[PDB]
Design a protein around this ligand. Structure first.
Ligand SMILES: *[C@@H]1O[C@H](CO)[C@@H](O[C@@H]2O[C@H](CO)[C@@H](O)[C@H](O)[C@H]2NC(C)=O)[C@H](O)[C@H]1NC(C)=O
Ligand SMILES: *[C@@H]1O[C@H](CO)[C@@H](O[C@@H]2O[C@H](CO)[C@@H](O)[C@H](O)[C@H]2NC(C)=O)[C@H](O)[C@H]1NC(C)=O
Ligand code: NAG
Ligand code: PRO
Ligand code: CL
Lengths: 579, 145, 49
């Protein structure tokens, strides 16, 4: 098969396939969901037991068996043929929803040429005297992201018809990926290389514009302080582990294909670490930028809870203007109780109990933490147009890189069967894949689209990857491993594997993965039903509602039709081999 | 004051109440010239003020030039001030959010400036470049079969 | 006017002379309060034109 070049690429392709939107978009949203410093510790713990050794295992297997993501396993024990099919199905389900993020980034970048920015002012109401109702309870940006780009219906039951704009943007994103995948992975080096270098000259610009905002240290002192209370929440730990397995790509059967091409003179033990660390490190970097800007937003909100109330007080019982800042606030709030109890009894239920600890925690909850925050720092700049263009170009580039990786992982085991690459040229295989995925991705752009995106973001990927990384290791180390495997030798010559890698991927990966699995199911089963977060415009705050029935069915099927292929293939061999 | 001007804010002594009364009389003079085509010589003593306070929130009403029992109805004072509010404001440097009249609110200016739908424009152009690419590439492709 | 405002320039009827006289009286009121510490009630009829 074709090969690599310069060598310095292979590691740039791995770095560009791992630094994707699992770090600058999904890690902040997760870290915000579970408390900040209650999501880091698990992260590191994992990364030093279950993220690095399995990456080294995957690269070694992909280098020694010399074949793709399905041919690699058949050559071990033909009763283990399914794992490749599960690893292809998962990558299919992943790309199908992963491209809509690039779609939304295109939509925002397109709208960021107007003036003034459309998410910076709210429309005028039915009598040209004040802003609209949703834009006063909710900020401007939340109104934009929930009612101009999505038109999100307030219930997973009240569905609708295909929207018009974000569908067209999804079409453009698929055309761009299909246009870039016109060269075969075996040689897409240029594009790979370019991504990374790009997406690093921006994050530092936002780190210099973040850490000087007024009220940008409260966000940090929140993102780092730990709470030994949520170190019980099992969803936090299973989400840490799945976060990892999703960020590196362990289980998508892609990394394998990569450490598959590459010439067999590498030193793999030093291309695992140099990848793994960098990945994790970049995530930390992003979580220092966002959870600073976010912090600023929070302080802003709190500042107003002090203006209005104070002004409110200033308006009622009267008081010389400019006399109720912050300290004076409490002062007069106290001196107005013991002086005018006639109206203090009827105003007291109103005084908005608003204090910094809340507005720092429930401000921009949801899947849009990278969209309704980085705007709260773009509508406060010098020349906002150019810098919003910069940030959204960064997101778009990361997404395109990650999608390149995924589509390569799904085309490698399709352009190898001498049957299929016999009556379909190498230009219409990619075409067929992109057309099918764009025609199926039109379910996330309806009026109830964001909920289906939340489902496909929460079950599929994570669960599948988990359930798989276990069969892989138990296949390499107790069916044909350690022995013949440690007999790597002539492959590289690193004389051995260090006895801190034998233990870690023959007797610690399976124990920990099985333990975490049961530890998570012990909560899903007794919880009852599952609950999602709806919009409820009439107030501008997300509420919680329990899932309907068929949504539960689809959650079940997205894990069944992805982790139930291995035993079906085992049965297919046990029963095929009859006569 | 201290909200709008922030600093540089002057102090509100009776010489300011004099200017306010005189300016309101001017506004009333203007209204009865370009609506009712009369000539009524309002003065600064025809603007009665009541309940001055720290917040500086008072009440006022206007009477005919020399007829103490003749109060100009409120729905006409609410129109003269609507006419000349932009000129009463700058006399004090206030800005329509620090000179509330509690019953007269501003309302003039809607948003509709885009003639061309810039989003559409940009999207359109971009799709062009990429289609060109994903066409020409296909041809160099059949070129090397 | 037409030089400074260019357009939007209002017209100069006697209601403007009234405002001018009243504002000058206000200025004089202010001067005899922060220089000479007196209280002199100037009016708009004390500014002859
Ligand atoms: C804001 O806080 C005040 C005081 O903490 C709350 O006032 C109390 O309201 C409860 C009703 O839920 C009464 O039983 C108490 O007697 C009230 N306390 C006092 C001192 O009057 C107020 O309800 C809070 N606001 C909101 C919206 O919950
Ligand atoms: C002062 O204004 C009052 C109006 O408030 C005038 O009173 C009117 O007088 C006429 C005839 O004298 C009556 O027909 C009206 O009914 C009166 N008005 C009201 C409301 O009752 C009064 O004449 C004015 N003073 C002068 C000197 O003209
Ligand atoms: C507000 O606008 C409507 C037209 O939509 C108009 O008919 C109505 O009189 C206006 N009301 C006020 C109080 O200005
Ligand atoms: O790298 C991948 O395959 C995707 C995108 C980043 C994390 N998971
Ligand atoms: Cl990560």
């Amino acid at each position: 098969r074709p090969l690599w070049a310069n060598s310095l690429q292979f590691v740039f392709a791995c770095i560009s396939y791992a630094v994707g939107l699992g770090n600058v978009w999904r890690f902040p949203y997760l870290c915000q969901m579970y408390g900040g410093g209650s999501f880091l510790v698990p992260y590191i713990i994992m990364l030093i037991v279950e993220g690095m050794p399995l990456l080294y295992l995957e690269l070694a297997v992909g280098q020694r068996m010399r074949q793709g993501s399905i041919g690699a396993w058949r050559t071990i024990s033909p009763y283990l043929s399914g794992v490749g099919v599960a690893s292809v199905v998962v990558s299919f389900f992943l790309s199908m929803y992963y491209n809509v993020i690039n779609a939304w980034a295109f939509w925002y970048l397109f709208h960021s040429f107007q003036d003034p920015l459309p998410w910076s002012v709210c429309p005028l109401n039915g009598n040209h005297t004040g802003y609209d109702e949703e834009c006063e309870k909710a900020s401007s940006t939340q109104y934009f992201w929930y009612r101009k780009t999505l038109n999100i219906s307030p219930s997973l039951q009240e569905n609708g018809g295909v929207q018009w704009e974000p569908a067209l943007c999804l079409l453009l994103a698929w055309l761009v990926v299909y246009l870039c995948i016109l060269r075969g992975t075996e040689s897409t080096g240029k594009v790979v290389y370019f991504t990374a270098s790009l997406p690093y000259c921006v994050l530092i610009i936002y780190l210099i514009r973040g850490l000087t905002l007024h009220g940008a240290t409260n966000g940090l002192m929140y993102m780092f302080t730990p709470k030994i209370e949520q170190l019980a929440n099992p969803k936090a730990w299973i989400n840490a582990a799945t976060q990892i397995f999703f960020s590196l790509g362990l289980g998508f059967g892609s990394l394998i294909a990569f450490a598959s091409y590459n010439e067999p003179s590498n030193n793999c033990q030093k291309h695992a670490i140099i990848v793994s660390l960098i990945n994790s490190f970049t995530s930390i970097f992003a979580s220092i930028v966002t959870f600073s800007i976010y912090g600023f937003k929070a302080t802003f909100n709190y500042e107003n809870c002090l203006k209005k109330v104070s002004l409110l007080l200033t308006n009622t019982f009267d008081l010389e203007d400019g006399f109720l800042t912050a300290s004076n606030l409490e002062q007069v709030k106290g001196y107005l109780a013991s002086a005018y109890p006639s109206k203090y009894s009827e105003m007291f239920p109103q005084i908005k109990n608003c204090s910094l600890e809340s507005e720092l925690d429930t401000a921009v909850q949801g899947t849009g933490l990278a969209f309704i925050v980085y705007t709260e720092a773009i509508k406060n700049m010098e020349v906002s147009q150019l810098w919003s263009v910069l940030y959204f170009f960064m997101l778009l580039m990361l997404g395109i890189g990650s999608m390149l990786g995924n589509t390569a992982a799904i085309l490698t085991p399709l352009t190898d069967s001498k049957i299929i690459s016999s009556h379909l040229p190498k230009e219409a295989i990619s075409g067929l894949v992109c057309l099918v995925n764009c025609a199926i991705g039109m379910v996330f752009t309806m009026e109830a689209g964001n909920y289906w995106f939340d489902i496909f973001n929460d079950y599929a990927a994570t669960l599948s990857l988990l359930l798989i990384v276990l069969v892989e290791t138990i296949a390499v180390c107790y069916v044909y491993g350690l022995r013949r495997f440690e007999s790597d030798l002539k492959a590289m010559t690193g004389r051995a594997v260090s006895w801190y890698w034998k233990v870690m991927w023959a007797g610690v990966s399976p124990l920990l993965i099985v333990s975490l699995f049961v530890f998570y199911l012990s909560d899903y089963i007794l919880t009852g039903t599952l609950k999602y977060q709806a919009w409820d415009a009439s107030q501008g705050q997300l509420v919680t509602k329990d899932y309907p029935a068929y949504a539960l069915a689809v959650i079940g099927l997205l894990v069944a039709s992805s982790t139930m292929c291995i035993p079906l293939a085992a049965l297919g061999t046990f029963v095929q081999r009859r006569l | 004051l201290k909200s709008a001007l922030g600093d540089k804010a002057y102090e509100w002594n009776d010489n300011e109440m004099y200017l306010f009364r005189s300016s309101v009389a001017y506004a009333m003079r203007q209204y009865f010239l370009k609506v009712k085509n009369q000539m009524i010589l309002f003065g600064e003593e025809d603007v009665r003020v009541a309940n001055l306070k720290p917040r500086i929130s008072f009440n006022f009403f206007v009477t005919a030039p020399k007829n103490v029992s003749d109060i100009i109805p409120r729905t006409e004072v609410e129109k003269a001030i609507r006419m000349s509010r932009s000129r009463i404001n700058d006399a004090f440097r206030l800005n329509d959010n620090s000179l509330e009249f509690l019953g007269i609110q501003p309302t003039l200016g809607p948003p509709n400036q885009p003639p061309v739908s810039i989003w559409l424009i940009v999207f359109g152009v971009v799709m062009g470049v990429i289609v060109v690419g994903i066409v020409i590439l296909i041809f160099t492709g059949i070129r090397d079969r």
